[PDB]
Model the fold of this input.
Amino acid sequence: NIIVGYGEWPSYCRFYTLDTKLWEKSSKGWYWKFPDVLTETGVFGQNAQFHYLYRSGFCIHVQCNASKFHQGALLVAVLPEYVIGTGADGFELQHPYVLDAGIPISQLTVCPHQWINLRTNNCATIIVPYINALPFDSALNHCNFGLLVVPISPLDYDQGATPVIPITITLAPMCSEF
Amino acid sequence: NIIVGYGEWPSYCRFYTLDTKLWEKSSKGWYWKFPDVLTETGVFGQNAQFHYLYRSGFCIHVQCNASKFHQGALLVAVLPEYVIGTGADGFELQHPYVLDAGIPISQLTVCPHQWINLRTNNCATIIVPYINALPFDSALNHCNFGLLVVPISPLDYDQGATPVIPITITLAPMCSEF
Amino acid sequence: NIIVGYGEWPSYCRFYTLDTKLWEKSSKGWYWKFPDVLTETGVFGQNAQFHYLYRSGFCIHVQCNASKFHQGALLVAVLPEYVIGTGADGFELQHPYVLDAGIPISQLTVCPHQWINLRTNNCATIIVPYINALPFDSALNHCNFGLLVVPISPLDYDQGATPVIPITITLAPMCSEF
Amino acid sequence: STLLGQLCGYYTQWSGSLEVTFMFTGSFMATGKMLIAYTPPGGPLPKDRATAMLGTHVIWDFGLQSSVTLVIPWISNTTGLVSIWYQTNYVVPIGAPNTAYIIALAAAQKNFTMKLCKDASDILQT
Amino acid sequence: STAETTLDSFFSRAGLVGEIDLPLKGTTNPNGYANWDIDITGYAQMRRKVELFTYMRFDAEFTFVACTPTGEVVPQLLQYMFVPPGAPKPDSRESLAWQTATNPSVFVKLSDPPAQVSVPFMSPASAYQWFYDGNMMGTFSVRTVGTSKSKYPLVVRIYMRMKHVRAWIPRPMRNQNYLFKANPNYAGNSIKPTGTSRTAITTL
Done:
């Protein structure tokens, strides 16, 4: 289904398909930062570094295609001002239990989130409004939020099946202002 | 005054100020080619070489400031498909009598033209519609027309006065399509 | 144009043309004090020293005639209670930068002022009401305000032209009371 | 040197719009053109006149006008830049001076505000 | 009444453009065929007249007059095949292009009135242009019908008339001598005045 973050639609004051992540049997999780992930891509990327003040919402779709003989579960969530403690390809979580920042993953469902169960569905949509303490900020020095994709239940299959599952992320800016 | 080329306004199917030419006592004349002159300049320049089909009109202003003790006259004219016989800085006429193409300058007043007499005025405006045998063409391989500025009467002054007169050309695209 | 000091016309509770100042290439500025400048002149001068209480407004015209080949600019301003730190002919400023009183000249435009640009105009008119903390004062012991004429841009010309420019001040008392 | 700077030296924060006025004090027979450009915060100084033309700018003609004004958009608390370039050369007849001067005047608009008064001064009483 | 200065009247007469020789023996055309690309500048005076404008649009009308070099009339048959632009041209007498049904032909005799055909406007664009800062009409192939060589020498003369003339954007007329075809090049070392001269400005 489609969830709207904090029950607010983006307002005023195309599709971009990134590369594919390969979910494995020993994967830990990945994260992306916004709007850093879209700063070197296309007209949005040019406007981000060719202006001074930036303000935009977003719409994120996460999909994965797997057979009926695979199993596993993923948690997709959005965390504003995601500072990390101890590009368009993201990073890998070193200690997924503490979310790499000293906070538990079991309480990550307090943020706008969705579940992907391979036996039930294969899609997740999140709509994020603009969150800041100021009406405008800098697109090259401040990261508004981060996106997390963590496998809570490990991927499993039988020998002879495809050992990697593709996870594709496609996103579209909404109500962008420069 | 303002003249409209062939009595047609540009139709559908900002200001750019170039560098300054220095009119001297031995000058012969200069010419510019369109839209070659505006192909490496700004958003118009990017669109010209980043598209396939181009179609636009133009509005050209030519000005010169001189004292009340200077004299001379210039002829400003627009000639479509100006092929030369034997950038943004233009070229210099080698044989201004034959217009560098084997045709007399005395009959250049058959084209959209204006006169600049230093004792009478200092401005000339020409509006050029789109002229072609096809609705669209290529902006990087075909030059639609050329602009000529030729001193019919030589510049003269007395010793101690400024020996060079500035001629500035400012142009604005009209009804541009890509 | 004509400006009215502080937006107040003189109220109740002939022309006098002084000598001519010669503006030079090395002039610094001059000032006059009121009503000291008109105390030895005519019926006004007799009434000033033959009474006890005085109260009057003023209207000041400053003019200068120069050729079209001269250049320069003057600032004319009125400063109430103009005390000087370290007649009808005025004094000369020793340190025009500090207005001879320790205050910057760049902020003199906070007072009722006018500009004289030799290429634009040649006249300046200021109307001064009566300013005091008491309804009446003494005309021989208290100077109400002072008038300043300072060249911000130096006078320049070519050799063979007239090297001195005449500045004439004419003033007329308004709503005078004795 | 402006009263606005001295008065805002008594506070801590400010924001609003400004305006700058230029006055030409040459002779009546001099002509020429100037380019006045404004660069927003975060940008560098343009390398040449052509680069400055592609942006916020105005062309000033000595013969037509004696004064020009330039409204500077919002400022707060890097800062914007103002640069003046030669468009043409300085044209003058015979018998007139070869040099002139420009006077710049600056002020604030009606949306300017100041906050958090300080005292902050270095002029000694005696 | 001012009807002699219209463009139709300005371009209104059939002029000689092109001439083809089919000698009995020699080296001009060793075989019995020739190829002539259609052009309007075969007439000597046509170029300076047409180049007064930039764009032109018209139809054409061709007439073929054939005879012996002395002017005699002999019993011979000819072909006069037309090759539209974008199509291959004959290479020999035995070429298979002479019988391709999409190239129209006009079989005629010498002892006949001259043949006459019409050609439409054949340009992809909306008009011909004599100047291009950056015009194929077809081809006429002439041969003698038969598998053997003819017994007579022949000459063929082609006349062209232009119909339904339209023009745009006048230009100054040519001033100096031409040097090439479809080239505004001029001799830069010898430039001549537009007209004659006189001794002094005060004398008639």
Notes: Chain A has one domain: 1-178.
